[PDB]
Amino acid sequence: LVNRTTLWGSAINDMHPRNGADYFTRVTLTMAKKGGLNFISGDTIDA
Amino acid sequence: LVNRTTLWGSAINDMHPRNGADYFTRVTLTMAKKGGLNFISGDTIDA
């Protein structure tokens, strides 16, 4: 006395073998410049 | 059964015999000053 359903399927999701990774790049940002303005608090960034 | 093909020619590519070097100057860009903003990093230089 049990009911059950199942889904199966196949697909492709991967990076291209030739130079696939070279298309992407990462950038990280910071808020530390001397004499900067912190918009979170509204004043100078550590003076 | 080997094929082969060659190219040949003559040309002149050189700077002028008479004071030719006097038509070019090199300029080097410096990027350091007390009140400057770095384009590459986006931060002030020495406050």
Side-chain angles (χ1 to χ4, degrees):
Chain A
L1 304 186
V2 178
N3 296 7
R4 180 162 184 160
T5 64
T6 306
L7 306 200
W8 177 82
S10 63
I12 166 65
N13 283 317
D14 195 319
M15 181 145 298
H16 192 270
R18 184 195 75 107
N19 292 5
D22 276 297
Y23 278 97
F24 294 70
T25 184
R26 184 192 298 174
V27 187
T28 61
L29 313 176
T30 44
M31 322 165 47
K33 61 163 53 64
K34 189 66 178 176
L37 193 148
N38 188 354
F39 87 104
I40 294 293
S41 302
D43 48 349
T44 59
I45 299 170
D46 200 27
Chain B
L1 285 301
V2 170
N3 309 1
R4 185 181 173 93
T5 303
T6 66
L7 313 186
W8 182 79
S10 79
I12 174 166
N13 273 348
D14 198 354
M15 262 185 68
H16 202 265
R18 178 194 96 104
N19 62 35
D22 299 351
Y23 288 76
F24 302 79
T25 75
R26 177 192 292 175
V27 182
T28 296
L29 299 174
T30 49
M31 172 145 188
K33 60 178 49 165
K34 308 315 280 292
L37 268 72
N38 188 336
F39 300 105
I40 312 304
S41 76
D43 78 312
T44 72
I45 294 170
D46 291 2

